Design a protein around this ligand. Structure first.
Ligand SMILES: C[S@@+](CC[C@H](N)C(=O)[O-])C[C@H]1O[C@@H](n2cnc3c(N)ncnc32)[C@H](O)[C@@H]1O
Length: 323
């Protein structure tokens, strides 16, 4: 059993991102306690969970209990896979219903008795306790540091344009398509989505109608050590002609906000036509465009729609569509 802690700002999107990665990894979510997900999966899922953009961490889930007394009792009956020295670190969620004061000391004593030493300042293994409606104990396998994503915001890129999604959301869009080989962004701009895809080890394709963006995205992709790219100057409504004998595994994009609606309709048709059967499109549209109806009109099935206000006079949805 595993656990994943998700970010709370876009919690349905975050849960669906985990669902998508678990589907690749042969597992599924079996419970949720606030922003703690109980996960039925194994090591096969680790490389996919490693991809997450809207999660705080994941790890092994070793104990679930309905009281501290029960938590400590079960923790004694578990073989703890501790590497090196450990420490206990509790995460008190907003819905915590338990007194966990001094729990790190108590659980620490239980685990220490199994022949493991405690290092409070530099642990090799972090034992985690989550407190929500229930108590959960396990071992953290990966922490996703928010800092790593903040460091890839637009003003840190050699080609700076303040026109990208948050890197975490760019990453989540890529993952919601479940791409494992490649992805296309036909409105690529400064390359924010393709940067995340490339960092995930995917082959990337990009289009932009502006030469400066084609040049700039390449500058940024090189900056992040992405090598497996194909960038083209051209029109997202003509992907069939741009990539004549190609069906893409996945598409993720944030289009400009021709008349707007006509561009969107034509781009949806063009993208549909170059997607593999079973392929997915992750895409944002401002809320005043009927994205669901228009995409379904061209043949897409809608898998997800997630609302986000951008600023005081702009709202959008993130969509996940399936051909
Ligand atoms: C706001 S940027 C979004 C970039 C990208 N999806 C991302 O990660 O944010 C939108 C880009 O679409 C480009 N664009 C506008 N019309 C286009 C078209 N018909 N075909 C391809 N690109 C287009 C613009 O030049 C701009 O760089």
């Amino acid at each position: 059993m595993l656990y994943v802690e998700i970010l709370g700002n876009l919690p349905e999107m975050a849960r669906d991102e985990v669902k998508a990665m678990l589907e690749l990894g042969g597992g599924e979510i079996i419970g949720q306690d606030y922003l703690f997900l109980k996960v039925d999966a194994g090591e096969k899922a680790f490389p996919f969970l490693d991809r997450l953009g809207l999660a705080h961490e994941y790890g092994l889930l070793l104990v679930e209990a309905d009281s501290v007394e029960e938590l400590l009792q079960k923790a004694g009956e578990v073989e703890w896979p501790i590497k090196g020295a450990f420490k206990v670190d509790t995460e008190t969620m907003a819905n915590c219903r338990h007194d966990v004061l001094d729990l790190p000391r108590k659980l620490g004593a239980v685990i220490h008795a199994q022949g493991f030493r405690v290092n409070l300042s530099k642990p090799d293994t972090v034992v985690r306790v989550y407190c929500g409606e229930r108590l959960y104990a396990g071992i953290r396998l990966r922490y996703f540091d928010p800092k790593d994503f903040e460091k890839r915001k637009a003003h840190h890129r050699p080609f700076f344009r303040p026109i990208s999604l948050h890197p975490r959301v760019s990453r989540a869009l890529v993952n919601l398509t479940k791409a494992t080989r490649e992805i296309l962004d036909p409105f690529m701009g400064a390359g924010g989505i393709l940067i995340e895809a490339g960092l995930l080890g995917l082959r990337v394709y990009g289009v932009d109608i502006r030469p400066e963006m084609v040049e700039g995205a390449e500058t940024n992709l090189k900056h992040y050590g992405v090598r497996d790219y194909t960038l083209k100057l051209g029109d997202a409504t003509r992907l069939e002609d741009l990539f004549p004998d190609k069906k893409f595994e996945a598409v993720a994009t944030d289009p400009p906000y021709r008349k707007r609606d006509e561009l969107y309709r034509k781009a949806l048709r063009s993208i549909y036509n170059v997607l593999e059967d079973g392929g997915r499109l992750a895409i944002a549209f401002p809320t005043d465009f009927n994205g669901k109806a228009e995409a379904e009109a061209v043949g897409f099935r809608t898998l997800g729609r997630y609302y986000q206000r951008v600023h005081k006079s702009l709202e959008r949805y993130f969509y996940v569509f399936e051909k």
